[PDB]
């Protein structure tokens, strides 16, 4: 039983995000969740009920006010379904994070565990929903050098290009972590970062000593009723200039054969993924290869949709779609294998998903253009789609173009 | 009126037989799985002459001249005519229809811009039955004159790289040593192909036959579909060869780019005539087997707007982007400067209109003959990245879909 209150803040638009970050500052050190899905910002505080999957997928724990329960881990998706069905959870927004290694675990691909949970789902104790200067309450500058270690990355890209030329796989996203000098101030980074971006969703969370914040450029998946959508963005140029340099870069992208190829190969794989969980004949491209503006960078983007088959649910669709093809590679299983052989730090949540599940929707945003901090590390991370035609130098520059989406706006 | 219903392997042979038995008679043959249609004679017809200056309507009662300010409106008038309404109509649309509909100036050829015919008799071949309704291979050298075509391609590449337009189909006509036996060529060529539609028409001393690899348009009720194919490799080797060429096609950046450029234009074309938000890609860039060649193919669909009919959709979609170019009007003008023989029906459409459809097949992989010329024709979509030698070879791969099956 939660009490609710509605407040009209007589606030100008300019003050809406400043007010949201100011609330977040008041949350201090408490566990919390922030999700932007226009026209709303959803803020959760504390933990009423949580599902926790540990880093190697061997232990599932359900926690609520009756205590901890261990659940069987025969399928993480079944644990998720059990969570969502629970009396503590039905009819409440659930805030979730899914780590990169959830994929290897679901697919029976051996992997070296990182430190972060594979999956968590949380119902918060308190919530604030901001919309157009109204609020509903439910209650009971860093300098970072993105050029550094750029040499070792070019080598990783070389290896990938060489492995693609040998036929091992067709596309792989190779990424790099940039260790940061200190922990960051989440509220301020959210404020400055967000105004410098135009993401499909924004998020921030703090849970069990781990935090992340980011400006998600695309959906892994959205399900509303029986309709499932995925939004592959792939093929990039900067937009770090005048409207003229940007338009020239847009033009240079829409017609560059290499980028078009990398885009369309990814879209075809997304179609194939949806066809696995959808009614025959229902999978269509609703928007084909249009340019999407994302702060420092612009990308070719497509929207693909289908109707879920009678025997499939949103967790089946999620398991197939995860991680985004555009953040992993083609064929997906081969690219996942390659990422674990080429990359030398755990991705953790990078290239994973942030979830908001509610009455009408299962919403899953791709974790890119994000910052991560825990007891051991504080970092940003960005990657690039590598294909046969890729060259190490362009791909290093491309990772810098993407890092410029967040790195300038990291605040202490 | 059904007259006879007499109970597949014998269908082609029978069609050939009609064509032979009743030569000197106008005949229209159309394949749309699971049926073949054959029309004979002429109960009513609309004829648009080669420069689009005269529309003639003919029925039994005689001949009429109709106002020809809009060819589409003439076609609509024919379709609502009391002698036509409720009957299947067999049609053809020449390349220069587009120029005319678009108010682009053109040099007229010899063939009609548009004909629509209601036959006097019809045979329908469906599920082991025919239903009757009533009131030597010639050797062709496809290498000859390739140097002239390569200069044509080089000129288009030059114009594209100057920014004059993005894509154009440059084609070449191959004059044949003799007239061909249409019904035998139909039989022999059909067996060697897997087209989306087949046709053979004979009308007013002109004949054309072919194995259409894609639809310009199909309208069924309010749903409009178009089927751009673009991006080609041979399928003329062993299955190992052919599967390797299919994989090479799916990953060749030049082919994928020329394909997606075309698909995006087809989307834009459908958006011009469909309900906002209804236009989708039902099939994105899958390989389509077409005899000597395999192609990247997409299927694009939409719901017609309340104020648009199938003729509005046809005039936007014609000729196929994949047989003309991008932007379409600029490409049409380029074709008219670059090519030196009239396309006539090449890159045009064959139509079948009935109770449950407006179907329009793209005219490629076809042979043509009249009182003056006997020829086959094939082209290639040229973009900034094209190589004249490759495009020449591609035309020869395409021509191999019909040239080996030309029967005298
Ligand atoms: Mg890229
Ligand atoms: Mg081609």
Peptide bond into B319 cis (omega under 30): yes
Residue from A165, A264, A387 to probe the interface with B (highest B Cβ count within 10 Å): A264
CA angle A86, A88, A91 (to 5 degrees): 85
Give, to the nearest 10 degrees, the angle between helix B388-399 and helix B146-161. Answer: 130
Please tell me the distance from the alpha carbon of residue A5 to that of residue A138, in angstroms, as a whole number: 7
Task: Let me know: does A42 contact A365? Beta carbons within 8 Å.
Answer: no
Distance CA B335, CA B168 (A): 7
Distance B399 CA to ligand 2 centre (A): 13
CA B246 to chain CA centroid, Å, is 24
Cα–Cα distance for residue pair B144/A5, rounded to 1 Å: 84
Tokens of A21: 């970050």
Tokens standing for B205? 């001393």
Residue B11 domain boundaries:
1-408
Q: What is the CB-side half-sphere exposure of residue B357 using CA atoms within 13 A? A: 12
What tokens appear for A76 in the block? 């993480």
- For residue B100, give the nearest of B115, B114, B117, B80 by alpha carbon: B114
Torsion angle (degrees, nearest 10) of CA A16, A21, A22, A26: 140
With residue A20 as reference, give the H or E element that holds it.
Answer: helix A16-26
Which three-class secondary structure state does DSSP give residue A17? helix
Is A114 exposed, middle or buried, given 0-12, 13-18 or 19+ CB atoms closer than 10 A? middle
Q: Among candidates A276, A273, A266, A323, which has minimal Cα distance to A104?
A: A323
CA of residue B232 to ligand 2 center, whole Å: 5
Interface test with A, best of B161, B257, B276, B384 (most A CBs within 10 A): B257
CA-nearest residue to B249 within chain A is: A261
d(CA B342, CA B333): 13
Residues of chain B in contact with residue A255, where contact means CB-CB under 8 angstroms, are 257, 261
- Name the residue facing B267 among A260, A271, A288 (closest C-beta): A288
Per-position DSSP letters for B146-214, written without gaps between them: HHHHHHHHHHHHHHHHTTS-SEEEEEEEEE-SS---HHHHHHHHHHT---SEEEEEEETTEEEEEEE-S
Residue A287 has a CB neighbour count (10 Å cut-off) of: 17
User: Mind telling me how many Å the CA of B226 is from chain A's nearest CA?
Assistant: 15
Q: Which chain B residue has its CA at the smallest distance from A260's CA?
A: B257
DSSP state of B36: E
Hey, is the C-beta of B284 within 8 angstroms of any chain A C-beta? yes
Q: In whole angstroms, what is the distance from residue A409 CA to residue A396 CA?
A: 21
User: From CA A403, how far away is CA A149, in angstroms rounded?
Assistant: 14
Instruction: Report B:385-404 residues touching A (Cβ under 8 A).
Output: 385
Task: Report yes or no: B1 and B134 within 8 Å, Cβ to Cβ.
Answer: yes
B251 contact residues in A (CB cutoff 8 A): 170, 261, 265
Residues of B in contact with A267 (CB under 8 A): 284
Nearest to B225 by CA among B320, B306, B345: B320
The pairing of beta strand B89-93 with beta strand B129-133:
unpaired
- What b-and-e string marks burial along A22-60, b requiring 16 or more CB atoms within 10 Å of the CB? ebbeebeeebbbbbbbeeebbbbbbbbbbbbbbbebeeb
The conformation of residue A183, written as its DSSP 8-state character, comes to -
CA angle A351, A353, A359 (to 5 degrees): 165
Q: Which residues surround ligand 2, an ion (CB under 5 A)?
A: B 232, 381
Cite the DSSP H helix spans in B274-361.
Answer: 310-317, 328-338
Give the closest ligand to the alpha carbon of residue B262: 2
Binary contact (A285, B280; C-beta < 8 A) = yes
Distance CA A218, CA A236 (A): 13
Angle between helices B11-21 and B182-191 (to 10 degrees): 170
Residues ending a continuous segment of chain A before a break (C–N > 2.5 Å)? 140
My answer on whether omega of the bond before A161 falls inside 30° of 0, hence cis, is no
Contact B42, B119 (CB under 8 A): yes
Residues in chain A: 412
Q: How many angstroms separate the CA atoms of B50 and B52, rounded? A: 6
Helix axes A186-195, A16-26, angle to 10 degrees: 160
List C-alpha distances in Å: A68 to A51, A52, A123.
Answer: 10, 10, 15
Decide if A282 touches B, using CB distance below 8 A: no
The closest of A99, A11, A2 to A56, measured between CA atoms, is A99
**Residues A369, A214: contact at Cβ < 8 Å?**
yes
Cα–Cα distance measured from residue A197 to residue B46, given in angstroms and rounded to the nearest whole number:
60
Catalytic residue among A31, A218, A395, A398: A218
**Cβ–Cβ < 8 Å for A104, A97:** no
Cis (ω within 30 of 0) for the bond into B34? yes
Tell me the C-alpha distance between B342 and B107, whole Å.
8
Across the interface, whether the CB atoms of B260 and A260 are under 8 A apart is answered: yes
> CA-to-CA distance for B386 and B393, rounded, in angstroms?
12
The CB-side HSE value for B378 (13 A sphere, CA atoms) comes to 25
Structure tokens at B282: 């039902």
Cβ separation B253–A255 shorter than 8 A:
no
CA B200 to chain centre: 11
Q: How far apart are CA B147 and CA B150, in angstroms?
A: 5
Inter-chain CB proximity A260 and B256 less than 8 Å: yes
Cα–Cα distance, A260 to A239 (Å, whole number): 18
The continuous run of DSSP H or E covering B119 comes out as none
List, in order, residues 6 or more apart from A392 with CB less than 8 Å away. A153, A154, A155, A157, A158, A161
Phi, psi (5° rounding) for residue A342? -90, -45
Alpha carbons B306 and B271: distance in angstroms, whole number:
13
Q: How far is residue A285's CA from residue A288's CA, in Å, rounded to a whole number?
A: 6
Is B275 in the A-facing interface, judged by CB distances under 8 Å? Answer: no
Select the residue of A267, A284, A289 nearest B280 (Cβ to Cβ).
A284
Closest chain A C-alpha to B208 CA, distance in angstroms: 35
Chain B residue closest in CA terms to A286: B280
**How far is it, in rounded angstroms, from Cα B293 to Cα B256?**
16
Locate tokens 């491209």: which residue? A285
Contact by Cβ (8 Å): A216, A204: no
Helix, strand, coil % in chain B, rounded to nearest 5:
30, 35, 35
Gaps in chain B after residue (C–N beyond 2.5 Å): 7, 135
How much distance in Å is there from the Cα of A298 to the middle of ligand 1? 10
Contact in structure between A332 and A173 (CB atoms under 8 Å): no
Q: Which residues of B touch A170 (CB under 8 A)?
A: 251
Q: Are strands A284-294 and B223-226 parallel, antiparallel or unpaired?
A: unpaired
Backbone torsions φ then ψ of A295, nearest 5 degrees:
70, -95
**DSSP bridge partners of B31:** B36, B198
Strands (E), A267-334: 284-294, 297-307, 329-330
The crossing angle, in degrees rounded to 10, of helices A314-321 and A257-275 is: 150
Give bridge partners of residue B226 from the DSSP assignment: B300
**d(C-alpha A344, C-alpha A336), whole Å:** 14
- Across B55-166, the runs of DSSP E, i.e. the strands, are 55-59, 62-66, 89-93, 114-118, 121-126, 129-133
Rounded Cα distance, A237 and A215, in Å? 18
- Rounded to a whole number, what is the distance in angstroms from the first to the last CA of chain B? 37
What one-character DSSP code corresponds to residue B225? E
Distance in Å, CA B80 to ligand 1 centroid? 54
Take residue B334 and report the two structure tokens written for it: 């380029």
Residues in chain B: 408
Start-end of H helices in A204-331: 243-254, 257-275, 314-321
- Specify whether the CB–CB gap between A273 and A320 falls below 8 A: yes
Kindly list the distances between the CA atom of residue B244 and the CA atoms of A259, B32, B398, B401, in Å, as whole numbers in the listed order.
23, 30, 18, 20
- A-B contacts at Cβ under 8 angstroms: 43
Paired tokens of A263: 């885009």
The CA distance from B375 to B176, in Å, is 5
A284 at B interface, C-beta within 8 A: yes
List Cα–Cα distances, B314 to A296, B101, B331, B358, B361, in angstroms. 42, 11, 18, 9, 11
Minimal CA–CA distance to A22: which of A39, A6, A41?
Answer: A41
Q: In what order do the strands lie in the sheet with B27-32?
A: B2-6, B129-133, B121-126, B35-40, B27-32, B197-203, B206-212, B366-369, B374-382, B167-175, B325-326
Whether the ω angle into residue A283 lies within 30 degrees of 0, i.e. cis, is no
Measured CA distances, B391 to A76, B172, B232 (Å): 53, 11, 10
**Structure determination method:** X-ray
Q: What angle do CA B10, B139, B239 make, to 5 degrees?
A: 65
List the one residue out of A221, A101, A80, A174 whose CA is nearest residue A383.
Answer: A174
Angle at A257 between CA A255 and CA A259, to 5 degrees: 85
Q: How far apart are CA B283 and CA B265, in angstroms?
A: 15
Q: Alpha-carbon distance B359 to B339, whole Å?
A: 28
Residue whose entry in the numeric block shows the structure tokens 């219903």: B5
Domain count, chain A: 1
Question: Which entry of B122, B214, B227, B397 is annotated as an active-site residue?
Answer: B214
| DSSP category for residue B320 | P
Q: CA nearest B111: which of B405, B317, B347, B325? A: B347
Question: E strand or H helix at A132, and its extent?
Answer: none
What angle do helix axes B71-79 and B310-317 make, rounded to 10 degrees?
140
Residues 6+ apart with CB under 8 A from B349: B91, B92, B93, B216, B217, B314, B318, B319, B360, B361, B362, B363
Residue A10: is it exposed, middle or buried by C-beta count within 10 angstroms (0-12/13-18/19+)? exposed
* H/E element, B250: helix B239-251
CA distance A88 to A64: 8
CB contact at 8 A, A378 and A347? no
Q: From CA A53, how far away is CA A56, in angstroms rounded?
A: 8
Domain harbouring B261, CATH code: 3.60.120.10
CB A377 within 8 A of CB A349: no
**CA-to-CA separations, B53 to A272, B76, B95, B174, B206, in angstroms, rounded:** 51, 17, 16, 29, 20
Radius of gyration of chain B from its Cα atoms, rounded to whole angstroms: 20
DSSP state of B34: T
Helices (H) and strands (E) counted in chain B, each on its own, are 10, 23
- Read off the tokens for B405: 């099956």
Distances (CA, A) of A260 to A205, A267, B17, B68: 35, 10, 50, 44
- What does the block give as tokens for A182? 């200190």
Is residue A343 flagged as an active site residue? no
Say if residues B19 and B148 touch (Cβ distance below 8 Å). no
Contact yes or no for B40/B27 (Cβ under 8 A): yes
Pairwise CB contact (< 8 Å): A285 & B284: yes
From CA B225, how far away is CA A408, in angstroms rounded? 48
- Collapsing DSSP to helix, strand or coil, B260 comes out as helix
User: Mutual orientation of helices A332-342 and A150-165 as an angle, nearest 10°?
Assistant: 140
- Would you list the DSSP string of A79-125? HHHHHHHSTTTTTS-EEEEE-TTHHHHHHT------SS-SEEEEE-S
Beta bridge partners of A356: A95, A363
| Residue among B263, B282, B284 whose CB faces A268 most closely | B284
Closest residue to B281, CB basis, from A257, A281, A285: A285
Answer whether A264 sits within 8 Å of B285, measured CB to CB: yes
Round to whole Å and give the CA distance between B92 and B39: 14
SS3 label, residue A402: helix
Q: Which residues contact residue A141 at a Cβ distance below 8 angstroms, ignoring those fewer than 6 apart?
A: A408, A409, A410, A411, A412
Alpha helices in B274-405 (DSSP H): 310-317, 328-338, 388-399
């Amino acid at each position: 039983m939660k009490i609710s209150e509605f407040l009209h803040l007589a606030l100008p638009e300019e003050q809406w995000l400043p007010t949201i970050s100011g609330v977040l500052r008041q949350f201090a050190e408490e566990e919390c969740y922030v999700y932007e899905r226009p026209p709303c910002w959803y803020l959760g505080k504390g933990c009423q009920a949580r599902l926790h999957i540990n880093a190697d997928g061997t232990q599932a724990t359900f926690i609520d006010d009756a205590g901890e329960q261990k659940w069987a881990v025969d399928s993480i998706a079944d644990c998720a379904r059990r969570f969502m069905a629970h009396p503590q959870v039905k009819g409440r927004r659930v805030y979730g994070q899914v780590g990169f290694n959830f994929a290897a675990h679901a697919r029976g691909i051996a992997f070296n565990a990182g430190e972060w949970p594979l999956l968590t789902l949380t119902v918060p104790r308190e919530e604030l929903i901001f919309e157009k200067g109204n609020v509903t309450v439910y209650a009971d500058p860093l300098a970072v050098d993105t050029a550094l270690n750029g040499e070792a990355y070019k080598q990783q890209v070389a290896r990938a290009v060489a492995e693609i030329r040998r036929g091992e796989y067709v596309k792989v996203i190779v990424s790099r972590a940039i260790p940061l000098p200190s922990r960051i101030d989440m509220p301020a980074t959210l404020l400055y970062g967000r105004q410098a971006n135009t993401p499909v969703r924004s998020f921030m969370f703090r849970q069990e000593g781990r935090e992340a914040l980011g400006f998600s450029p695309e959906l892994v998946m959205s399900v509303t009723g029986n309709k499932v959508v995925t939004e592959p963005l792939a093929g990039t140029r900067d937009r770090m200039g005048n409207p003229e340099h940007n338009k020239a870069k847009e033009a240079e992208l829409l017609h560059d054969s290499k980028e078009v190829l990398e885009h369309i190969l990814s879209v075809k794989e997304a179609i194939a993924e949806l066809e696995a969980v959808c009614l025959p004949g229902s999978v269509v491209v609703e928007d084909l290869m249009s340019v999407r503006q994302r702060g420092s960078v612009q990308h070719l983007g497509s929207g693909v949709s289908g109707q879920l088959a009678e025997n499939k649910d949103a967790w089946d669709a999620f398991t197939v779609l995860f991680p985004s093809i555009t953040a992993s590679g083609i064929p997906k299983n081969a690219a996942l294998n390659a990422i674990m052989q080429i990359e030398k730090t755990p991705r953790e949540l990078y290239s994973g998903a942030i979830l908001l599940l509610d009455d009408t929707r299962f919403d899953a945003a791709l974790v890119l253009r994000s910052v991560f901090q825990d007891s051991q590390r504080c970092w940003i991370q960005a990657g690039a789609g590598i294909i046969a035609q890729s060259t190490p130098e362009r791909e290093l520059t491309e990772t810098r173009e993407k890092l410029a989406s967040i790195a300038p706006y990291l605040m202490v």
